[PDB]
């Protein structure tokens, strides 16, 4: 098998990790196991640190410097690999003992535990005029050499490595997302009944969604237009909480439903990136450097409140209804329904990306 490696500019430090993608399960995290090779020909400083940093990266609204960011930390953990910590006593993984067998006594193991309820790796799509760093939530492993923990780390004496926390679709499919709504009008006696359902609960990225639509028009009115939209909801709880609703795909069929008749049709929508490069704020899966990545996977929560960015999806079905009569244009005539579903990647049967 293979492993990843990255060296500092001055060569004194070389960080080794076993993989870049770490599977987030329900509550447990996979361990972050690796080694740090410290060359003793240059070591004298008697203390080598490795630091795990969970940071929220964002760009400043008042600065016109593309790519200029600041990182607000959400979780920081440190381990002193050399010399072995007097308190820390941890078992080595099989991978780790193999790494020690390869490098020799100069390889010092380090193992970080990422606590649960932390945000997964999410990258916000940059705008048209920013080419630098990617904003959002990202991870960074920084191993460095210093006299103590307070000193400002010189970049030539350091190495940073981006890693990602990802999630995969649950093995057992949930119950079918269904939703109905009943609009009773004031001046009308018969109600407007709208039924919609999805074919299943878990979808993969780029997979068609089949919308079973049943319209029961017991009214005197006529359904003039059907608006379907997939909207990605992102809740970002950091300083305050914000929300927005952004349509990422849509089709508006002009299919009309006459009075006292039924309707049945299958609509097929696919959310994709190709027609969305011009938008701002769209959530994408974490980037290693600057390569394109797909639409953000659904966030799996634990029943408390979680820091960071929580992503979800709902399908909206909107009927545009004619006006006139007694109340003119005073009363709105729209009918909506919302359908949450799960959008995640299938579990890799063979190898990680």
């Amino acid at each position, epitope marked *: 098998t293979r492993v990843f490696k990255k060296a500092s500019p001055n060569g004194k430090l070389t960080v080794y990790l076993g993989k870049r993608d770490f599977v987030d399960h329900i509550d447990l995290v996979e361990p972050v196991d690796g080694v740090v090779l410290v060359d003793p020909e240059y070591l004298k400083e008697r203390r080598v640190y490795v630091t795990l940093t969970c940071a929220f990266r964002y760009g400043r609204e008042d600065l016109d410097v593309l790519g200029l960011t600041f990182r607000k930390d959400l979780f920081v953990a440190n381990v002193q690999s050399f010399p072995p910590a007097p308190e820390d006593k941890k078992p080595l993984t099989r991978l780790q003992e193999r790494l020690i067998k390869k490098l020799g006594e100069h390889a010092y193991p380090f193992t970080f535990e990422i606590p649960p309820n932390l945000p997964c790796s999410v990258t916000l799509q940059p705008g048209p005029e920013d080419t630098g760093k990617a904003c959002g939530v990202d991870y960074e492993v920084k191993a460095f050499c210093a006299e103590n923990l307070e000193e400002k780390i010189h970049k030539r004496n350091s190495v940073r490595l981006v890693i990602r926390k990802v999630q995969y679709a649950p093995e057992r499919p949930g119950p079918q997302p269904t939703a109905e709504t009943t609009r009773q009008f004031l001046m009308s006696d018969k109600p407007l009944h709208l039924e919609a359902s999805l074919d299943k609960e878990i979808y993969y990225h*780029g*997979e*068609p969604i089949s919308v079973n639509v049943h319209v029961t028009n017991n009214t005197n009115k006529t359904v003039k237009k059907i608006k379907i939209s997939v909207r990605q909801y992102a809740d970002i709880c950091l300083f305050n909480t914000a929300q927005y609703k952004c349509p990422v795909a849509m089709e508006e069929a002009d299919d009309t439903v006459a009075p006292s008749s039924t309707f049945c049709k299958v609509y097929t929508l*696919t959310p*994709f*990136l*190709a027609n969305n*490069r011009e938008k701002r704020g769209l959530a994408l899966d974490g980037k290693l450097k600057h390569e394109d990545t797909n639409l953000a996977s659904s966030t799996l929560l634990r029943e408390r409140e979680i820091l960071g960015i929580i992503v979800s999806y709902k399908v909206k079905v909107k009927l545009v209804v004619s006006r006139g009569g007694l109340l003119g244009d005073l009363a709105s005539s729209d009918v909506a329904v919302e359908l949450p579903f799960t959008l995640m990647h299938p579990k890799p049967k063979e190898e990680p990306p």
Partner: antibody
Amino acid sequence: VQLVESGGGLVQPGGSLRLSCAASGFNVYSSSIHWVRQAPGKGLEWVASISSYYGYTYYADSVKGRFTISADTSKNTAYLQMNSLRAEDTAVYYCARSRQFWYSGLDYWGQGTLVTV
Amino acid sequence: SDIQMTQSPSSLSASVGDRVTITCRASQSVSSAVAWYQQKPGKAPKLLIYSASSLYSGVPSRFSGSRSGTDFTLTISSLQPEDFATYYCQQYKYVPVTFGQGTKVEI
């Protein structure tokens, strides 16, 4: 699940053909579609690729400016417009599919169409 | 520039039951992006190996892939009567993807 090529035959040098690749059973926004040609008695040469999900097209250097790949996602069909054809371009044109997330080889191939120039 | 995929040998002969080793060396570093294809004459290519060593689903277990640096090996442990065809390598870490000239195995 089936890939079917079409629009081949004999043509005088400098003529044109339009290839169609009707896909069925799978989709277009979760799969990338490729064209790979094989000259008589020679090896395999990649010529074109399209990822409808990202809206990007890729071409071999020999066909830049002359071939244009497109796709009708509503009809689940890809297209390859081929102008200024020369005799060295005579080959069997295969339509192939790959998994968009993520690339794990070309796992389904069509029977191919013969193009003689 | 284009990645050159030197595949060797261009052709080889073996008998039923022999262990066949088809090497393919890349002109520059390709990480795990190697595929092996089986094409029979007049037929469409069949996927055999992906991600250098991962056996694709539905493919007989006698096929295995290995990587030593920039060298890649396709091994057929127990040569079966239908494994006689032309085998191609493929790099797919850099654009454009380029294929090897092929190795035709005959009885």
